Design a protein around this ligand. Structure first.
Ligand SMILES: Nc1nc2c(c(=O)[nH]1)N[C@H]1C(S)=C(S)[C@@H](COP(=O)(O)OP(=O)(O)OC[C@H]3O[C@@H](n4cnc5c(=O)[nH]c(N)nc54)[C@H](O)[C@@H]3O)O[C@H]1N2
Ligand SMILES: Nc1nc2c(c(=O)[nH]1)N[C@H]1C(S)=C(S)[C@@H](COP(=O)(O)OP(=O)(O)OC[C@H]3O[C@@H](n4cnc5c(=O)[nH]c(N)nc54)[C@H](O)[C@@H]3O)O[C@H]1N2
Ligand code: SF4
Ligand code: SF4
Ligand code: SF4
Ligand code: SF4
Ligand SMILES: [S]
Ligand SMILES: [W+6]
Lengths: 963, 214
């Protein structure tokens, strides 16, 4: 036996960092009673098989950390010190602040006279770091209190993906999962540094390589990912659409598209209206006044019944495929080579290697994360990847898909629970002021007359009803609908988002902020503005693991505590391994994990902090009364707790949903109190509840499916690593989305050697088929109105086809593809004192703002200081030696870092000019460690765009000087 | 006995191995600075049994050959460290017969530390300024005897780190050397007949580190 582990109890957990979702085994002293003694990998976990990157490996030093918050703290207005307080105090005095701010600021009707029932005086940030049950419960707490400004991490990295893939495939999620990477014949890694930022992903990427796959990295920088790829193709910042456009044209020129897949399963055959056109960088219906498009001009030619007309022959010159051929004609190798900075030889090599996966029995996958989509055309970048994957027949298949790598361990789940301004849980939109009744809300659901189109979003009413019945089970959904707040249909959707919250805060238009499991003082672009803007809050609530640059902004650099009147409540929460619950990984795997050690000191799980805090407000209204009390009073928080504390188990079961009476549905009998088997058995009449329709099937009468640790697989499942009995994924355990596209019309897979589903005598075999019905009877994209994979996507703001508009301003004056330079539906100074393109990115060893990893000696050991990576060219220009201290400055601020002179950074040729790029990690902050440096967001602009509301943290102008 | 196969053609330099080694033995962190490299700690020490060394090499075309070397004791079949230390006290350094682990005992506080380092052709041994104890990779001999993989081998996500019976690991090294050669035609196994940590180098081992081979 091993003395260290000998007397410790062994529990399983899931890594609290990135969205790979690696398994841990935790060892806790005193047979579970005491502290953790060891944390390492779960050797039985199918994703990581016991392997951990340094972030996962060091989780012991995260949990058992002497710098962790021990009890609630209080900073009094204008004070320069923390006063330790009790929970009883913190949660009461917080509950008083909420109720006061609400009572005073709560308006029942907007200027237009439409019912809204909301406060715009309180904003919430966070978080993808909470359990799925905490994120849901938190979202509903804030919405009962009538908040609309509810945002988190997803807005920055995740928000561009959802519209792009939703438009293209019908859903916003990663199409496949991590294990599936091993089945790919070519892996294109672009806008991702996966070897550093999803490191266990590279277990499966290199098993793709072991079996003959080509690994391609397309990145402005040579990274640790680049070190292990067959092909490194250097691309200059923002030249991605040119790169992908040239690939689309290459695929069509050389006839490498999967013809049958394209004809049957994409919208290639659909006839676009005569109103659609494209000239010199502009589509038809362009309004120069409002810088918007009239998208009705892009509509399909509809048949007698209102169904889009199809020409299966693909001849009609207004066939999507023919308009597609016309549009990408301009993206020739010479033009694309020139703008990307990638040589014509190496472009051909990458196109040849990747477009070869157009073979029916070859699968190509694309991995991307955040790096490349931090501008107004991020959505069109992903759309270009969706369209390539549709042409080659890579969507639905094993080793295929669009692998949109999620960031945080539960950013998938936190988004699924609607912790963004525009979505309730289950991605049902937050109603606007003009959706005055529940019927009107349900009327906005589009329909299809096509008898081969499932059009599953038709069931929205069942989900919205079931959701209102989970919050307000004693009320009719139609009545319950009036309790929750609404946004102005007048205003811009981005007016309720991340960037505008800082802009509003800086204009003192917020009383209170919840910074719940986030570090906005380092995470927010243009930190100086944000740190100042926080001083214009009355009260601030930081729930976190450690004191940090947000909690303690008032005593930050060049801040005088005396002058700052912000009342701050710091609440210390328990670490992942100190609580039970579920997180959804990038693959939609909803994984259950268990407590190992008891919460450290007087720290609580987030669910207990928010439930107690709400319970205080609830009783505060029962005592005093005040503004519209029905939503707070009537909210069903009794189904959230057992034994006077937050119950992950019970919340999970509510989110799944159960029958509220004896119910006949789907030709099956169900008794009151029974768990809903799946979202197929939800109802609009109020018979059923379900906090999240996507969760319907996660926790059935059969038990907690998320908690299954069962590696049982049929041969066909084992051949591609579905692991359908390991945990559970939405929707209803469909591991690979659009899998109906992986077979012909007879139900035979395109690649039998790597089948996802297969029609074998009467049944689909392998994965859970994504859409019921016999082979050849239904269009494979069930969440799409028309049922097809969208090459042409007229729902997008920028146009139905991706088109290169320059996301760079300063170094560019000529679009070589049109007379339209910048995004015509989206001001930068470009001061010549700042001539270099600054960029921010991650190293393997640190996490986010480094609030967590700057507290871990071993991660600080490996990466102790903010650095600045520069080419040998810029080094000799600025007279900067490797390791020399440097000043990096912009219009927004400046900082010092250690120079790393490397050939891994190169100058870009932009309009026959050497433009030097300089690289910074945003993992640093003034709080810790000593000589660590501060956030790289001192330099970044807080200017976004009115569509995405995302700041440009990846290409911003800076100067770098020796010290 | 037991053997490591380190296929350096799969290393992402994630440094999972470096952190996992310290987490298992609960070793303290060094005081480090950035001096224009990601590499840290710079060298092995009393408290660091393994550091990942980063080397950038020029190549015509875009990018570089980025060389990653997770350094540990080689656990040599005929340890120069033992032979040296046995002139002072036969016991300070012992070879475990079942695993093949070369282990430094507490009696290394008696022997000459600087002299046992010099005897080492890989420059592995490190002295405690206080104790005068020699410390290095102990092979996770603890875990191996109890049927667990070494901490650095378990944590490794790329398949760079392999561990097992020396017959099986020799077989894997020869097989993998053949396959890797197809892309890196100058790939060589580090001192296959002398050491129990067989590194597969993609090129001249001296590029990875000056003491990468005896
Ligand atoms: N180690 C570590 N891993 C993490 C995180 C962390 O903090 N540390 N955070 C997690 C989170 S929340 C997220 S959202 C993900 C993000 O994961 P990634 O998106 O991989 O993160 P970055 O390293 O910021 O950016 C990825 C790459 O984009 C490249 N890039 C920059 N500009 C362009 C461009 O114009 N085009 C292209 N094609 N590439 C470009 C950069 O050079 C960089 O190598 O990582 C997650 N995983
Ligand atoms: N320049 C630049 N800026 C960026 C980025 C970039 O690439 N470049 N990336 C952007 C992106 S994609 C993201 S995701 C944001 C992230 O920005 P933030 O989310 O603000 O980052 P952190 O707060 O450092 O990391 C997550 C937080 O989760 C907390 N946490 C961990 N476990 C728990 C728990 O159980 N409960 C609670 N309540 N909290 C917990 C940690 O203490 C930590 O504070 O930063 C953005 N900012
Ligand atoms: S950070 Fe991501 S890759 Fe690393 S151990 Fe955690 S889940 Fe696995
Ligand atoms: S050997 Fe494995 S764990 Fe160590 S740095 Fe290389 S890939 Fe990471
Ligand atoms: S075998 Fe054990 S002691 Fe040696 S480097 Fe690996 S983890 Fe450290
Ligand atoms: S590598 Fe050096 S310290 Fe390790 S066994 Fe060989 S001679 Fe001794
Ligand atoms: S994230
Ligand atoms: W993120």
């Amino acid at each position: 036996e091993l003395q260290k582990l000998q007397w410790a109890k062994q529990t399983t957990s899931i890594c609290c960092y990135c969205a790979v979702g690696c398994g841990l085994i935790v060892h806790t002293a005193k047979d579970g009673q005491g502290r953790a003694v060891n944390v390492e990998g779960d050797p039985d976990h199918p994703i990581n098989e016991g392997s951990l990157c340094p972030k996962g490996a060091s989780i012991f030093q995260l949990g058992e950390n002497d710098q962790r918050g021990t009890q609630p703290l209080y900073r009094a207005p204008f004070s320069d010190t923390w006063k330790p307080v009790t929970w009883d105090f913190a949660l009461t005095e917080i509950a008083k602040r909420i109720k006061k701010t609400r009572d005073a600021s709560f308006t029942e009707k907007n200027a237009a006279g439409d019912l809204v029932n909301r406060t715009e005086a309180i904003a919430s940030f966070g978080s993808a770091a909470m359990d799925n049950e905490e994120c849901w419960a938190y979202g509903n707490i804030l919405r009962s209190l009538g908040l609309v400004y509810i945002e988190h991490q997803a807005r920055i990295x995740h928000s561009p993906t959802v519209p792009a893939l939703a438009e293209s495939f019908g859903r916003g999620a990663m199409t496949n999962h991590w294990n599936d990477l091993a089945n790919s014949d070519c892996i294109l890694i672009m806008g991702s540094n996966a070897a550093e930022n999803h490191p266990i992903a590279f277990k499966w990427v290199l098993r793709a390589k072991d079996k003959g796959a080509t690994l391609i990295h397309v990145d402005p920088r040579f990274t640790r990912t680049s070190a292990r790829c067959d092909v490194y193709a250097p691309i200059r910042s923002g030249a991605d659409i040119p790169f992908l456009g040239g690939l689309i044209k290459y695929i069509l020129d050389n006839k490498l598209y999967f013809t049958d897949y394209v004809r049957e399963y994409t919208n290639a055959s659909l006839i676009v209206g005569e109103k659609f056109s494209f000239k010199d960088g502009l589509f038809s219906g362009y309004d120069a006044a409002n810088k918007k498009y009239d998208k009705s001009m892009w509509a399909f030619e509809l048949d007698a019944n209102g169904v889009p007309k199809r020409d299966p022959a693909l001849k009609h010159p207004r066939c999507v495929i023919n308009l597609l051929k016309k549009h990408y004609e301009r993206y020739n190798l010479d033009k694309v080579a020139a703008i990307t900075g990638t040589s014509k030889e190496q472009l051909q090599q990458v196109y040849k290697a990747y477009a070869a996966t157009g073979k029916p029995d070859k699968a190509g996958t694309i991995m991307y994360a955040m790096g490349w989509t931090q501008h107004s055309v991020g959505v069109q970048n992903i759309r270009a990847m969706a369209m390539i994957q549709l042409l080659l027949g890579n969507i639905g298949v094993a080793g295929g898909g669009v692998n949109a790598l999620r960031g945080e361990s539960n950013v998938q789940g936190s988004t699924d629970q609607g912790l963004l301004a525009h979505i309730w849980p289950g991605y049902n939109p937050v109603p606007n002021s003009k959706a005055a009744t529940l019927e009107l809300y349900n009327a906005a659901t589009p329909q299809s007359k096509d008898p081969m189109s499932v059009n599953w979003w038709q069931n929205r009413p069942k989900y919205v009803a079931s959701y209102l019945k989970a919050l307000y089970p004693d009320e009719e959904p139609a009545a319950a609908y009036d309790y929750l707040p609404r946004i102005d249909a007048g205003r811009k959707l981005t007016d309720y988002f991340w960037l505008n919250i800082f802009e509003k805060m800086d204009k003192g238009e917020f009383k209170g902020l919840f910074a719940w499991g986030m570090n906005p003082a380092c995470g927010g672009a243009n930190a100086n503005k944000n740190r100042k803007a926080m001083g214009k809050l009355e009260w601030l609530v930081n729930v976190n693991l450690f004191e940090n640059e947000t909690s303690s902004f008032w005593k930050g650099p060049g801040m005088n505590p005396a002058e700052i009147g912000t009342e701050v409540f710091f609440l210390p929460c328990c670490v992942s391994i100190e609580k039970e619950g579920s997180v959804a990984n990038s693959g939609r795997w909803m994984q259950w994990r268990y407590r190992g050690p008891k919460p450290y000191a007087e720290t609580k799980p987030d669910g207990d902090i928010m439930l107690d805090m709400f319970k205080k407000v609830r009783e505060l209204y029962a005592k005093e009364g005040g503004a519209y009390p029905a939503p707070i009073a009537k909210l069903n928080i009794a189904d959230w707790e057992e034994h006077n504390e937050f119950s992950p188990t019970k919340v999970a079961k509510l989110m799944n949903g159960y029958f509220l009476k004896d119910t006949e549905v789907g030709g099956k009998q169900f008794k009151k109190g029974q768990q809903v088997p799946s979202f197929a058995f939800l109802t609009a009449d109020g018979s059923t509840c379900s906090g999240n329709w996507l969760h319907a099937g996660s926790f059935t009468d059969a038990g907690n499916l998320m908690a299954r640790r069962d590696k049982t697989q049929t041969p066909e499942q084992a051949r591609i690593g579905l692991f359908p009995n390991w945990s559970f994924c939405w929707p209803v355990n469909r591991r690979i989305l659009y899998n109906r596209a992986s077979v012909d019309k007879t139900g035979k897979p395109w690649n039998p050697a790597k089948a996802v589903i297969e029609w074998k005598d009467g049944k689909w075999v392998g994965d859970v088929v994504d859409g019921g019905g016999d082979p050849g009877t239904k269009h494979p994209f069930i969440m799409q109105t028309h049922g097809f994979g969208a090459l042409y996507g007229p729902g997008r703001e920028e146009g139905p086809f991706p088109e290169h508009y320059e996301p760079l301003e300063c170094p560019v004056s000529k679009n070589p593809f049109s007379k339209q330079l910048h995004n015509p539906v989206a001001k930068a100074v470009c001061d010549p004192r700042y001539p270099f393109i600054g960029t921010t990115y991650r190293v393997t060893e640190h996490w986010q703002t480094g609030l967590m990893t700057r507290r871990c000696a071993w991660l600080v050991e490996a990466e102790p200081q903010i650095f600045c990576e520069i080419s040998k060219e810029l080094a000799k220009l600025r007279g900067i030696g490797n390791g020399d201290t440097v000043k990096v400055s912009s219009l927004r601020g400046a900082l010092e870092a250690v120079a790393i002179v490397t050939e891994r950074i190169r100058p870009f040729k932009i309009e026959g000019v050497d433009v030097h790029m300089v690289g910074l990690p945003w993992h640093y902050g003034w709080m810790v460690p000593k000589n660590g440096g501060d956030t790289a967001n001192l330099l970044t602009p807080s200017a976004g765009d009115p569509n995405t509301g995302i700041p440009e943290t990846k290409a911003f102008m800076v100067d770098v000087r020796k010290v | 006995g037991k053997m490591f196969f380190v296929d350096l053609s799969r290393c992402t330099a994630c440094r999972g191995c470096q952190i996992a080694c310290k987490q298992w033995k609960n070793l303290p962190a060094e005081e480090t600075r950035n001096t224009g490299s990601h590499q840290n700690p710079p060298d092995l020490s009393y408290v660091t049994l393994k550091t990942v060394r980063f080397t950038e090499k020029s190549r015509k075309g875009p990018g570089i050959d980025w060389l990653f070397f997770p350094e540990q004791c080689r656990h040599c079949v005929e340890p120069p460290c033992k032979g040296q230390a046995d002139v002072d006290l036969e016991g300070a350094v012992v070879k475990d017969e079942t695993t093949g682990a070369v282990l430094f005992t507490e009696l290394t506080a008696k022997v000459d530390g600087e002299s046992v380092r010099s005897a080492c052709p890989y420059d592995i041994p490190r002295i405690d300024p206080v104790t005068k104890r020699l410390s290095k990779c102990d092979m996770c001999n603890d875990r191996v005897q109890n049927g667990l993989l070494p901490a650095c081998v378990k944590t490794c996500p790329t398949g760079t780190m392999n561990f097992g019976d020396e017959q099986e690991m020799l077989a894997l090294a020869e097989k993998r050397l053949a396959e890797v050669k197809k892309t890196y035609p100058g790939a060589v196994l580090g001192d296959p007949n002398d050491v129990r940590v067989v590194y597969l180098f993609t090129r001249d081992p001296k590029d990875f580190y000056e003491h990468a081979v005896a």
